[PDB]
Write a protein that binds this ligand. Structure first.
Ligand SMILES: Clc1cnc(Oc2ccc(Oc3ncc(Cl)cc3Cl)cc2)c(Cl)c1
Ligand SMILES: CC1=C(/C=C/C(C)=C\C=C\C(C)=C\C(=O)O)C(C)(C)CCC1
Lengths: 16, 242, 232, 18
């Protein structure tokens, strides 16, 4: 799936 | 308490009298010959019209049987006429699946109604959406996994029947009472029948399932359109969800 | 603690209340350019909270330990029910209306004039009006939403079983909290769950209106909200 | 709701069909 990524993106760094 | 055991008694009877045996009667509606077998194959060009027609016929039959069912419920017929409509239109289909589930078999995922055996293929071949049907096989596999008892099945049906959020109603407060009353009894019956089937959150699961029915029902009104013929074939089902 | 520490759920709820500030720019003047369309305001809000929603889920014990694919799946699956349940519980305070995470209010009539009454009205009686009555707390709210989040039936899931089990744990943790914090309320647990079915229909109707408003153009819908509305 | 007539027909009509 090359769509529905901003979700994925945000699910990869809530640490910061 | 006591008046409850009475209500459940009332329901159970209305149910066993009007719907419990609706499945054996499916042979009255021109079921295509194959449906009598448990192993096919079928004709890739074989007229689908007959099968679709059958699906519409058994549903009409099931909805009118479900109504006769509600009429045997004083608590129900004791509501505004237009209120009874909104509850029927809102839960007829839902009650149908809760009741149809008793014919569903897990080892085969097939529906066994009398001499007949309804497989998932049949529905797809009939024209319904795979996604939709898949959501239906899911509901049934789930509900059947909980190994419910006859009192819990009808109890779950009545909890769906008396739902306030159902569009079109008016005596919401009046109906809401019936539901909350219906739920308590359902839970009570569960609790007072502890472990060794448990799955404990059995009441928590049925509430899940009542939610899944919601989605499933929300899909019917959608399928009817995407299929022209059907609508005409069965006006009643078209009225119920329209 | 017990895999689903009711203690961590209420914190996840308290991390993204929001809590403070979010309602100072909406209930204290603002709005760059202009915004009076209830539907649009609701849509900008939903896009806003769609982010806090990601934060949330992450703090729900065990969520983040699931495969990346699964998290995306579960969040795609119930974002609207989760979002609705939250703003509806935040609205327990307001009169005939809801309080959007941006600070703006929306009342019965405004929704009607926007043509979204009915679905808005049932939110008010099936969710807010109902949460107010039994005074459900942020812990219970978070527990229902968690339940909503862990749905084994979403398609594509890597491990339906894991998702199944986690959900059963919230059931355990919640029933417990209820039997405790509210001993004089025997059926509270069950009364809480009764919301689920109604929350589902509302969810379904909100998606319908949403898809309609998307095709018609107008009433702009920020990204993310747009990325959740691409037919599941 | 104005509509819904088959339903109304069905609710009352005394059952035994005929
Ligand atoms: Cl006994 C039995 C009955 N139905 C079965 O399958 C279906 C088929 C279609 C459907 O949706 C619809 N069904 C009928 C109509 Cl008229 C309209 C829709 Cl949307 C719901 C269930 C199976 Cl597998 C067995
Ligand atoms: C209820 C409702 C709608 C849908 C809302 C959705 C899907 C999410 C809202 C999130 C908010 C408002 C979150 C918050 O602020 O916390 C629409 C627009 C169709 C119209 C009015 C009723």
């Amino acid at each position: 799936a090359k769509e529905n990524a901003l979700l994925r993106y945000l699910l990869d760094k809530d640490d910061t | 308490n006591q008046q409850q055991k009475e209500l459940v008694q009332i329901l159970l009877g209305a149910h066993t009298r009007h719907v419990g045996p609706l499945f054996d009667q499916f042979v009255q509606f021109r079921p295509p010959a194959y449906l009598f077998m448990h192993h096919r194959p079928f004709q890739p060009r074989g007229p689908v019209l007959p099968l679709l027609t059958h699906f519409a016929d058994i549903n009409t039959f099931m909805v009118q049987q479900i109504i006769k069912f509600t009429k045997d419920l004083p608590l129900f017929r004791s509501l505004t006429m237009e209120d009874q409509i909104s509850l029927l239109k809102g839960a007829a289909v839902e009650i149908l699946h809760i009741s149809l589930n008793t014919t569903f078999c897990l080892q085969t995922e097939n529906f066994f109604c009398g001499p007949l055996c309804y497989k998932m293929e049949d529905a797809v071949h009939a024209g319904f959406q795979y996604e939709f049907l898949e959501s239906i096989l899911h509901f049934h596999k789930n509900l059947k996994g909980l190994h419910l008892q006859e009192p819990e099945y009808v109890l779950m049906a009545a909890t769906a029947l008396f739902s306030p959020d159902r569009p079109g109603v008016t005596q919401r407060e009046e109906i809401d009472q019936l539901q909350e009353e219906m739920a308590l009894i359902l839970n009570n019956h569960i609790m007072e029948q502890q472990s060794r089937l448990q799955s404990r959150f059995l009441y928590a699961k049925l509430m899940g399932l009542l939610a899944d029915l919601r989605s499933i029902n929300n899909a019917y009104s959608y399928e009817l359109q995407r299929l022209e013929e059907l609508s005409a074939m069965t006006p009643l089902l078209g009225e119920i969800c329209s | 603690n017990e895999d689903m520490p009711v203690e961590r759920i209420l914190e996840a709820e308290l991390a993204v209340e929001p809590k403070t500030e979010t309602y100072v720019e909406a209930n204290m003047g603002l709005n760059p350019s202009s915004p009076n369309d209830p539907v649009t305001n609701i849509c900008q809000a939903a896009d806003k909270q769609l982010f806090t929603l990601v934060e949330w889920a992450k703090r729900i014990p065990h969520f983040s330990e699931l495969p990346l694919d699964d998290q995306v799946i579960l969040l795609r699956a119930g974002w609207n029910e989760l979002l609705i349940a939250s703003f509806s519980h935040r609205s327990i305070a307001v009169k005939d209306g809801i309080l959007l995470a941006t600070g703006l209010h929306v009342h019965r009539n405004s929704a009607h004039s926007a043509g979204v009454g009915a679905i808005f009205d049932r939110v008010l009686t099936e969710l807010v009006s109902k949460m107010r009555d039994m005074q459900m707390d942020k812990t219970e709210l978070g527990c229902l939403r968690a339940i909503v989040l862990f749905n084994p039936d979403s398609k594509g899931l890597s491990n339906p079983a894991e998702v199944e089990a986690l959900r059963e744990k919230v059931y355990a943790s919640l029933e417990a909290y209820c039997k405790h914090k509210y001993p004089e309320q025997p059926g509270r647990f069950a009364k809480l769950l009764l919301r689920l079915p109604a929350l589902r229909s509302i969810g379904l109707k909100c998606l319908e209106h949403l898809f309609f408003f998307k095709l018609i153009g107008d009433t702009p819908i920020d990204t993310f909200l747009m990325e959740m509305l691409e037919a599941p």
